[PDB]
Design brief:
This protein has a seven-stranded mixed sheet with strand order 12-11-10-14-19-16-17, with no helix packed on it. Strands 23-22-25-30-27-28 form a six-stranded mixed sheet. It has three domains: about 140 residues, Immunoglobulin-like; about 150 residues, Cupredoxins -  blue copper proteins (Immunoglobulin-like), CATH 2.60.40.420; about 150 residues, Immunoglobulin-like. By secondary structure, it is mainly beta. Helix content is about 10%, strand content about 40%. Bound molecules: copper (II) ion. The site of copper (II) ion (CU) has 6 residues, from loops. It holds the Pfam family Cu-oxidase_2. It catalyses: 4 Cu(+) + O2 + 4 H(+) = 4 Cu(2+) + 2 H2O. Belongs to the multicopper oxidase family. Its cofactor is Cu cation. One of its GO terms (molecular function) is oxidoreductase activity, acting on diphenols and related substances as donors, oxygen as acceptor.
Length: about 475
Amino acid sequence: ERPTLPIPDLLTTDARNRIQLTIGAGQSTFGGKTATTWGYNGNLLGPAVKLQRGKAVTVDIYNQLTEETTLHWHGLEVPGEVDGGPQGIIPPGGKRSVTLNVDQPAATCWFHPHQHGKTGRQVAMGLAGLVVIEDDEILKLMLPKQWGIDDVPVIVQDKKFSADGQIDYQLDVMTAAVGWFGDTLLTNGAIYPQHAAPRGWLRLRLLNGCNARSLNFATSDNRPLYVIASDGGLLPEPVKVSELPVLMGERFEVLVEVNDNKPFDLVTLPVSQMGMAIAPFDKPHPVMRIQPIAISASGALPDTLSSLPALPSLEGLTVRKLQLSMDPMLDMMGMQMLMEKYGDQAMAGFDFHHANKINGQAFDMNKPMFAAAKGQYERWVISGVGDMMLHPFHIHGTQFRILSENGKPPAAHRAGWKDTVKVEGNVSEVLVKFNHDAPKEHAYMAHCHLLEHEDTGMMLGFTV
Ligand SMILES: [Cu+2]
């Protein structure tokens, strides 16, 4: 509760409607020990790219690594050609430009690499940034809006380090099964930082940027969170909660009341997921310390945020079934290594590189599974019947509606605009529409956002 919370620079267009992102390596320090890290416009993580609905921007992307990478805009409704999936290679030393014509509601999205079979490693190395989409609707609401004062991004990620201090990442049979997770928790790159927040309302834009660890946010003194937005933007009205589960890649925006001068913690609560309840995550774990201060803020919590469209009628819509599966050998072999390495705490609460799949096929980049309709709602049925793993299933090129999440209607705060849906040993249904095109050369991806599962096959391509 000591270093101040790092705040990503809010990056806007220049006079020529361009934005420069440089992808480079550098050095970060975690707990006294230095580590090689990757970042956008810096050594670690990245900026918050600010975009206005209905305004085009060109982004110039400079790969200053010595290996290939891609830049995917997670949550953005844009054509496949700029979507930055594994076919959007930026060679080392190379420069690629993309045009983003933003046409979707205000939201906190994010961007990260999407290299073929290396997404987990590139994100673990430090690469992630934010996208703040604004529109006319949101600025009329009088929410907390002072960036890095009462409107603050909170990117929570776990990492594991070697004895030398270097990030200890590996795509092996255990991580291919259960995911890459660590024992150290970072908040905008820092360990248990403090943020100084004005009395009144504090707005937190939460991002679970872990490779595989699911989270569950609360406060130390159990004051509520007022959920105001999901992956794809504002909810119709606030949802007041005591805790907030957040899957890998999901974003929620919450308001928290800063009503006295007593400091408290934003925390994450222990979750039931293979590997994730191992100490120190067997108990509530602090994310950041919040320190009330008496400086000016005028943000507020409205009664009503937005009006969303109704769910479409289901009659006549195309149904697409996506069956997620793991090779049994991976499951057991991965489970053995987990039990070997950690023991009984691990469950508290044959090429493995193509062992994870959808409709019995490990991802093949030259063969898109189908062409989805443009401008027409479809019903996608995603089943995890057959294993007990957690699958936060993400679909590019869209913000959808969850019709059913793992056997029930979605929770109220998950019933708005989402690009991620929980699949865990059951079936989920989403109502999805694609407003933009994606040819086979720049196909959209649908995949599990437990990145090691993605990297080892749990992904498909599709065209629109
Ligand atoms: Cu998965």
